[PDB]
Amino acid sequence: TLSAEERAALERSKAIEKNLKEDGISAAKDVKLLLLGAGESGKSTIVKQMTGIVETHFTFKNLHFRLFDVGGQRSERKKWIHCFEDVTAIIFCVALSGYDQVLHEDETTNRMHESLMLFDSICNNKFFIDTSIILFLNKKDLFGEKIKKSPLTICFPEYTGPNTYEDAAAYIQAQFESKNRSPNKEIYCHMTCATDTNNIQVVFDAVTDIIIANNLRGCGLY
Amino acid sequence: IAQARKLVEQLKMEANIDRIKVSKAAADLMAYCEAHAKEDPLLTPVPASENPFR
Amino acid sequence: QLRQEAEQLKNQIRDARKACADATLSQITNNIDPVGRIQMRTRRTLRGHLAKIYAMHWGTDSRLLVSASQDGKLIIWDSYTTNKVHAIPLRSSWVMTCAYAPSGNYVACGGLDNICSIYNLKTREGNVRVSRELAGHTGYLSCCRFLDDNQIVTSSGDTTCALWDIETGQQTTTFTGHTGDVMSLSLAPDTRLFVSGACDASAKLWDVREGMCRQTFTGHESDINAICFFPNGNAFATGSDDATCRLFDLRADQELMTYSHDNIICGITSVSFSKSGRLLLAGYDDFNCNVWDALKADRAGVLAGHDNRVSCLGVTDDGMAVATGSWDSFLKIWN
Amino acid sequence: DVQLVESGGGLVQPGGSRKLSCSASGFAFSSFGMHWVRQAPEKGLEWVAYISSGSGTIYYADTVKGRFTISRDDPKNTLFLQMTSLRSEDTAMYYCVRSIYYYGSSPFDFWGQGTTLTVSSDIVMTQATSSVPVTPGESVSISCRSSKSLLHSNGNTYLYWFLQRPGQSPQLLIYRMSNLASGVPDRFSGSGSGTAFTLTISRLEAEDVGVYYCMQHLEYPLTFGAGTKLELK
Amino acid sequence: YSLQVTLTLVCLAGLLMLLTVFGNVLVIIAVFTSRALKAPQNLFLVSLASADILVATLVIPFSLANEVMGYWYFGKAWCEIYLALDVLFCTSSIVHLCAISLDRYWSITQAIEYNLKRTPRRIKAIIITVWVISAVISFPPPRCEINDQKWYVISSCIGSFFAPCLIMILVYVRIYQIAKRRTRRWRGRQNREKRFTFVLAVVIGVFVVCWFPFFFTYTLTAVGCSVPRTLFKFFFWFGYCNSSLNPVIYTIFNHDFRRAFKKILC
Ligand SMILES: Cc1cccc2c(Nc3ccncc3)cccc12
């Protein structure tokens, strides 16, 4: 057998193991969300509604949320992206108002196109292949003013649709819903006016639906 | 401007490196490997006794 | 104009390197005898973590090792008995690197919070405490190494590396010019030079005392994810998402040999050398780690039973064993 | 900083009961295993009891068994010893000692000031000498003997050396007959075979005058050798 | 009894025992060796596999001996315990299936609350409750026959099969309705509808087809109909055979389990 010193060391190791397991079990209850905006997107507004990675946590209807945003990370997103692979869902904020706004760098880069392309890259990633995405289209008031008096054709040349506005909002919503190759993975979209107070409710419903879908996958009912 | 000048200045002394013959460098690497190969346990399996990890 | 000057230098220097290039490791090492079929077997399995393991490091005693995982915890393992010596709860759960002080009194960890944390293992209160919070970087921490008990070198996403004075908490030196997220670094045995690989597909050798790059190595088709020095501190090897490993000679300023196989198409996460340098080990994104003959450039033996990407790999100072950490929250000791 | 204070001793008639406690402050008391060590009024040190860090392991001496119970309450950082049917020879001086067990640890590193109490097989460490005539500036060696080999199959010989200067609590010097306790002058050096051990003191001074004890940690009950005293001829 | 057909029968039942133990232990390992399988709900699968291994390993030979040998040559002091242990093992397997179904239903509906209450402590509590109910139901009763008391047989059969069968049927019907309602790219969704109908009908049907005949025919004998003749032995054998297939139904339709089994095999 082993000496008294090793018996004590093994007891300490077992206590450490038990504490580690208890911490892991306790931490597994909360839900982790990745916030992925684009520049002037309404991600800051969403966070306010509620230098490296910024973690914001909150409890809503006896549920604990952990929302991470990588805004100060100006490095290449290709690296460190795999860290948020086992994450419950994503939050994506596109500014409907961007439809008519070349990127500040003035590279003739339609704000929305940059977002459409960024969204496509994020959705068709090796990781995050099965992570449902919560899509936020905020600044409806702005989109609402701009959609009248300026055509969405500027952003989507193949508009082929009524200029104003709920229909325009449906065109852009569907254009974002597209380029989702994977099945069994839904994108929940919401229209944000920048002053609503039910976005917590919408995210909670999306998370509950995601949890229900995951539980129905374990039963083998993919 | 300043960046180009800094790059040229850096290259002024990154190409001054005295570089040895590649064949002799490889020979030196091989000689070190042969000399220290005896003590390497992963290269030459050690007896089950004197093996810290059972 | 000055750009043209830089180009002409890049041209003349290349015409000069090719001059000091008559033979190849292969041609010179075409008569050595093959190592054989290295068949290492898991001897221990550390199964305490609950999430992906992103880094590990051996202590100088070759018995204790520290591993960091995404569950926001650092574990000090006693490899001989598979006992947990310490469990350090990290303030930030996004840890991507860890280091063991050569003296063994401190352990450093860092990650996506852009700061490097130093932990005191020897305290009168018998608990691990954070001693210093090195926060000067802008991007995420990528690698850390202890020059001594009071000096540490780190790499970050700033495309820069820094040398720190722990007591003062200030960067005593900074190394700029990587034009790409520095993703790893290694310390020479002489402890006066070190190298770092970056996403710019190049690795640069730095002088710690001075603080300027001396030699820049290129010819790597993609990012660089791992770098390690040869045991004699006269060469080093690099991994990459290119699916190839390479080693360069400091005194030759040139590539010596390439370790690639057609069947292997995936990135390389870590590299390491055996005590004698005859064996080069490299973790792969294919869930397994291959072993390459240093001079023959042949895969001596594939070596892994991990369930996900082998994130970290490390050989003991006595060379007795090699530890592999993977995204399956498991650490395996191979001997 | 770290210090242990205990006060539960006093004049007790034979056959009575008493409670002893030492309050631990300045360190993570919950992460340390605690020991009780008894010293007779005249001389000698002997282990009494021990409670693990998690209070999941407890040990006692032969005479302690059936009369003494050791308890701890980590929330309040206090160590407890209960005495029942106290015997006349039980009158002695009590110390509570912290001890942490992991790879490369230093158990028995800190000792309390102690509390006096008055009333009315096993490994035999053998510190042969009992007094050593010495002068400052000259070396001195003290040897300890054990009945059974202390060298475990691990390669660690669990032999400890303590120094107890007059009128003050004992302090750890060497653990495992090869290591040096923190904050200890380098002149001390422990070495020996699996059964015989010794020390080397270089340029001895008047500050090292006292009594030294060798203890084994190979297996319980922990045993102490009688001490070897130093003088100033 | 038969002279060469006995060899065919003994051969066939040994085959059964082998397959059973093999699959169940494969599960216990995969579950215990797969990190992705470290979930509190798989303790139910582990307990079911252990119970099935015990039943197959020990109860089968005594029943394989019986019928084959043709009489209870083993200690008559064992029939009163052999029968009770057989009943306990089978009822424990059935109750484990019912508890797994109930956990699945409670996870699908009221998902947030039940996930909050999906502690391994609760999982173990449910396991112990299942085992204790199985022990309680089995505690009462040159040859050995099963108990024949009408009231005891009727009560035991009812409370050991009919209730869990009804519970499973109701829970899985509700789950099917929920999936259908949530069913409404489109080809993938309609492919998914077909896939879930299947995985559920198989789960709903194997258990019924394997146990209902015996328990139906068992009560029929108890109530007094007792029309079952020899076919009861076939129904009896169909019920045990069901245990061997039980792990397959509950593990094959899960990718994490399929990949674990593939790794184990290769
Ligand atoms: C009430 C009850 C519940 C479970 C099992 C029982 C049993 N044993 C079987 C029956 C069918 N197949 C395999 C084993 C015999 C008699 C009664 C039982």
Characterise this structure:
The complex is a heteropentamer of chains A (222), B (54), C (335), D (233) and E (266). By secondary structure, chain B is mainly α. Chain B has one domain: Transducin (heterotrimeric G protein), gamma chain (G Protein Gi Gamma 2). Chain B has two helices and no strands. The termini of chain B are far apart. Chain C has one domain (1-334): 7 Propeller (Methylamine Dehydrogenase, Chain H), CATH 2.130.10.10. In chain E, α1 (5-33) runs parallel beside α8 (231-252), α1 packs across α9 (255-265) and α2 packs antiparallel against α8. Chains in contact: A-C, A-D, A-E, B-C, C-D, C-E. Chains C and E meet through loops of C and loops of E. The structure holds N-(5-methylnaphthalen-1-yl)pyridin-4-amine (A1CIU). N-(5-methylnaphthalen-1-yl)pyridin-4-amine binds at residues 86-87, 90-91, 146, 156-157, 160, 214, 236, 239-240 of chain E. Chain E: Keywords: Cell membrane, Disulfide bond, G-protein coupled receptor, Glycoprotein, Lipoprotein, Membrane, Methylation, Palmitate, Phosphoprotein, Receptor, Transducer, Transmembrane, Transmembrane helix. Chain E: One of its GO terms (biological process) is female pregnancy. Chain E: It is found in: Cell membrane. Chain E: A lipid is attached at residue 266 (S-palmitoyl cysteine).
Q: Could you say which structural class the secondary elements and strand pairing of chain B correspond to? A: mainly alpha
Distance between termini of chain B? 64 Å
CATH superfamily of chain B: Transducin (heterotrimeric G protein), gamma chain
CATH topology of chain A, by name, is Rossmann fold
DSSP helical segment count of chain B: 2
CATH superfamily of chain A: P-loop containing nucleotide triphosphate hydrolases
Q: How many beta-strand elements of chain A?
A: 6
Number of domains of chain B: 1
Number of domains of chain A: 1
**Approximate shape of chain A:** elongated
Structural class of chain A: alpha/beta
Helix content of chain B: 40-55%
SSE topology string of chain B:
HH
Membrane topology (chain B): Lipid-anchor
Subcellular location (chain B): Cell membrane
Family (chain B): Belongs to the G protein gamma family.
Organism (chain B): Homo sapiens
